[PDB]
């Protein structure tokens, strides 16, 4: 019956659902992910190890420290990107003008950008210049999309709802500001709020452009020659799983879990080998009886494999005392 769970990541279970990379470090007592310290040439990221189903809602609620320096006020950069990618789990965008989003293909997201790249970045940067409507000083926030080659474009428009905009509250002091990304699975509306300032857009076009309805989440920051302490504080991230299989190990007499249910996560179409844990159950005094795969249509009992779909699957292995 349960195929795809609605998960809430919080500071205590973060390492179970997410993985830090590069310069990123995590303090579990505070829920603070430090993506970069305020130093040269850093890059750090955290990625969510399960695909997010955009047919369902999802919500990040937490705080962000963007640093103490920005365009026109010291040499601050590069900014923090929050990316949703149709590509494989665990991938992250590039450093510099890409702001953690550029480099992913057909992706979309939001960035807090403290370094205005006024002139066109070179080809390797995977980013177009930041827009003139945010030039002239101050950090800015914006939606961002990338094309099939991973090139990032800061989103602009004639609308106050979604146009790129200089931050109402500039990062002068290393203060954590409220940050929220809220997404509605029915209306496809994504709403982003940083320090009292809001951006909102129906993202159904970017979703359709991506070729899929489920996404790999990454949060990535870098420093170049320009620097800043860049941190995200959990806070919580709530989402519904895609491309998972639940595997249960159940007492055939009672109907109770013998060991905890296991969730395998993968990319869509990935063939994943699942484990009936036979030896382990034997050690607990249990012998294999049967399997119920009726909630996993791709289940292959000969190879012990499932093929991840857009939705969830569940396989139950039964054992007897
Ligand atoms: Ca920039």
Author numbering: 253 to 573
Paper quotes:
To further investigate the plasticity of these junctions, we determined three crystal structures for each of two consecutive modules: L-lectin&β-GF (Phe245–Lys575), β-GF&CDHL-1 (Ser494–Thr663), and CDHL-1&2 (Ala576–Asn751). We superimposed each of these three structures over the corresponding two modules of the full-length SraPBR structure, always with the C-terminal modules aligned. The results revealed slight twisting and/or translation with intermodule angle changes of 9.4°, 11.7° and 14.6° for the three junctions, respectively. In detail, residues Val496-Gln498 in L-lectin&β-GF, Phe571&Thr572 in β-GF&CDHL-1, and Asp661-Thr663 in CDHL-1&2 undergo slight conformational changes. The N-terminal module adopts a jelly-roll fold with a β-sandwich (β1–β17) core architecture of two antiparallel β-sheets packed against each other. A structural similarity search using the DALI server revealed that this module is most similar to legume lectins, despite sharing a sequence identity of ≤20%. In contrast, the L-lectin module has only a Ca2+-binding site. At the apex of the L-lectin module, the Ca2+ (named Ca-1) was embedded in a 7-coordinate geometry. The seven coordinates are from the side-chain oxygen atoms of Asp365 (bidentate coordination from Oδ1 and Oδ2), Asp382 (Oδ2), Asn369 (Oδ1), the main-chain oxygen atom of Tyr367 and two water molecules (Wat1 and Wat2). The interface between L-lectin and β-GF is maintained by several hydrogen bonds including Asn257-Glu493, Arg303-Asn519, Arg303-Ser494, Leu341-Asn519, and Asn466-Asn562.
S. aureus encodes a 2,271-residue SRRP termed serine-rich adhesin for binding to platelets (SraP), that is involved in the pathogenesis of infective endocarditis. S. aureus SraP, a surface-exposed serine-rich repeat glycoprotein (SRRP), is required for the pathogenesis of human infective endocarditis via its ligand-binding region (BR) adhering to human platelets. We determine the 2.05 Å crystal structure of SraPBR, revealing a rod-like tandem organization of four discrete modules: a legume lectin-like module, a module with a β-grasp fold, and two tandem cadherin-like modules that create the rigid stem of SraPBR. Further structural and biochemical analyses reveal that the legume lectin-like module specifically binds to N-acetylneuraminic acid (Neu5Ac), which may mediate adhesion to host sialylated receptors.
